[PDB]
Amino acid sequence: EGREDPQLLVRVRGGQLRGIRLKAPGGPVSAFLGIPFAEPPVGSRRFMPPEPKRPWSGVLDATTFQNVCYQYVDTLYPGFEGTEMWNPNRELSEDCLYLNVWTPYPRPASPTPVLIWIYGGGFYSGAASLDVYDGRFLAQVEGAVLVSMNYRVGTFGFLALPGSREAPGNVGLLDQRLALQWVQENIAAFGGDPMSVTLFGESAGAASVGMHILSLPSRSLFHRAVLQSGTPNGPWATVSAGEARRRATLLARLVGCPGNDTELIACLRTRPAQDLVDHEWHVLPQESIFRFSFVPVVDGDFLSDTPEALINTGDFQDLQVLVGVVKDEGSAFLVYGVPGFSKDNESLISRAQFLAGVRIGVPQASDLAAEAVVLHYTDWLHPEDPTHLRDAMSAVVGDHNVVCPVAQLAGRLAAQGARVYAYIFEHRASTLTWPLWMGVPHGYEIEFIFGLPLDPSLNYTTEERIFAQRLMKYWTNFARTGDPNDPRDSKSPQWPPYTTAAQQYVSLNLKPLEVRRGLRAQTCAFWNRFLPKLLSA
């Protein structure tokens, strides 16, 4: 300990940690990377709820990110930045339950609001160690204390035989909850305020934030929530108990595992990690995009009912939420399975290809429902136009899966006492390597929120760097106060709360805040109010 930097030695419940002094553009920050918050969920602990980390002795080195949770690695376009930046940047292992802390350097004098980030990746991938999730900018410029955790994905995190003890389901949400409990117990050691914790997340991260909102034990572990482009309701974020059982049973069958729950899980346990990954996609009921095999399950425990039933009957009075979407939520998903679509051409499609694409984007639709979608999205002045058909296909996937479930969520939370703020994110990064026709794709607001444009060596424009500063300001103000608006700041335009009466939300882009009314309101009535009844009768 003699010669170490005194500002980097911290004790937590399990013992002593040494962090690292990192350079941010404006000055130094403190990082504590790869803190274990759980016993390594390996061997007989696969599929199992996580157990609190046993204390170590000596000084645990927390200067590097730890292993990423075992997952499928995207290889659709090897070498391409657009996909590689989401791929694991550390070795895969089932031994992966670690979290990461960024704080100002020196650590703040007085209790500081805490941001907890939950990554996305369809519940089958992701990592808290990705460059785009780097907490140094928020820690340095805003003084934030930032935490992000690994949680198990795919089979390891969500394979379930509901009702059993050996694979209860939702263990990936349980990992996240453990990390939240860790933050309650330990964040003060870092100068964080456990009495002011904001969750934020994008995609499946956002659906996770959503599920902590809807799960009572989690509710005492945070105060405010930010859902970016993801919701707990909707067609992909959860499965019924029955459907989870079918999928788990089929996967077991496909890897050579024969009847009752104990035998079946013991055999899966047993199989090499890569084996479960190699077969994970084979268990989906239909040809489809935006569907993932192993997701949170409606177990009657972590989720005591469907998310739809819970948002409809909950009282959300003590709650402040920020929710929003990007302009082109669906575009990037199309190249993963809709024929006619590719990142290396303009992807102009015919009416045939559009109808075939709808059956893949809306796998649960009968021929009547699919016709309804195709008719709703047709441009009747130019019904054969391949540019519009291509943008229709993107909007279908984007609206059904993200925009309309978000609009629905905002509407329910507002109606039942929550303070809600809503945005559509509309700026395409000058650095984006996906094609122009993809517009502003899923995930590309992250990036600005974490303030990467502030790095002089990333080649963003000055306007983009200013924009990043604005977004960090809204996000941390929300964390700080429950309100994204700057209280001191006279000259600026105000971001109003979303309400059922006025349906007000804001545009985030290079221009000042513009207030808009109704979030794809006509189309969301189609998806949220009409389409369900069609699929019912």
Place this chain on the structure above:
Amino acid sequence: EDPQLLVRVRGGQLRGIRLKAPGGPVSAFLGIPFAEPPVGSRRFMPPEPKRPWSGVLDATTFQNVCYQYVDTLYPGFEGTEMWNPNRELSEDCLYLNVWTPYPRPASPTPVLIWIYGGGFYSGAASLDVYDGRFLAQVEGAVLVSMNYRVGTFGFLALPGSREAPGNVGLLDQRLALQWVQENIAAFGGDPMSVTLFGESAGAASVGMHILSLPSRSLFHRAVLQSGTPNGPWATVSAGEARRRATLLARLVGCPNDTELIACLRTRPAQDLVDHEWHVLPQESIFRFSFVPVVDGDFLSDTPEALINTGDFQDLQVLVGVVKDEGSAFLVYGVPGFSKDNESLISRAQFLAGVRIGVPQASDLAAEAVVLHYTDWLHPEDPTHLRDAMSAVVGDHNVVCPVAQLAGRLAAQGARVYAYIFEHRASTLTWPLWMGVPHGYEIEFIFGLPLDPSLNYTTEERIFAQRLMKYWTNFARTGDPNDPRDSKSPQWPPYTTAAQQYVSLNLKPLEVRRGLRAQTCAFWNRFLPKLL
């Protein structure tokens, strides 16, 4: 004896009357018999041609109006009285009217034939709004209008029977059409240039002559104003007509087909009219009990099947709608609606209204209509709900059937011109909220604003002149554009890709694209697949 008012037709000699038009004299020949009176045992039967007469037949007045229900919703109000019979009611009513220039056209003149509307249960060729003198005088047109049988009298069918075969009101129209072929040259008309035009049930009539072979050699061009033979109200199936005829008979104490019609023929006219409205299967508006039947004869198949398979290559058609087709219909049955208040309604009332406006809708289809017409920023605003109700009725019954017809005729070789009429008459007595109601362009097409004693504005007099010019240019050439006027924009043909149509209002022609295209996709393409 004025020689310009003496004409010899095939049935004998006729004498008309010199009328005053603001510009000058016209010749009128009113009450020319074109058929034997369909009385007694000819009730419900095809018309037979009129027997020859002797001496000189006095054709100087409108004859009886065909027996029909008379609207008593608002007694003595102009808005409804102007559509009511203005002559005596009678089963003896098969008379037609002819206006020509004075003196009579020197050279063969294109002929316009007017077929009145009135839901197939009413109307007369004798209403002031159908006055042919203006078109005759200003544009030099030969105009013909005929009475045809309506209600039980024109349309009660026992399909398959000798004695009530159905569609006899259309056969009356056809007989008047053949009569024009045989006689109009005596008036200086050109039997080689005949244009049908009609509004509402009369537009549906025109459309049926387009879809019926024997009619097709009696006219060259057609105008369909605010109605079509396709759509939910213009035809019934053979089975549905038999159901209705049998029910009417039962309601009047009658009694095999022969015995049932025999007893119906013994019933006074008014006893039949009395129970006319009790036979509809559902409480509804924009539905009429006795309309053309798909008999397998006049109509060899449903209008939809016929427009989908027809070759319409030698045909020109003008079609259009007024801006607020459904509004006038709401006060005739929808709870919450009245001409004497602003008719602000609730959401509950909108759905109750949809059940009456779209009577064939299931709960789910009714929900689809309601969801589609809702304004999602103000889902409770009473003004929008009221206007939506009007749009549901207008789109479902008129606008979207018109769009379908236009699309099909153009896809299959017809030259098609389409319009939306958007001028509300300064003289109109319906309330402002009704906008521009069903029927209210006829006024202008006939050129009534050219009458100084009616005091339309000067701008309306000019407007009326433009529309008379369009309509007769079209009758003259199958194209409403003025073949010597070198002025923009030209009214372009409606085609299935560009979907160009024009708005007729006080301002010059504006070309628009897509006739409520999104909404018509809902009615024409989704909603049927739903039921």
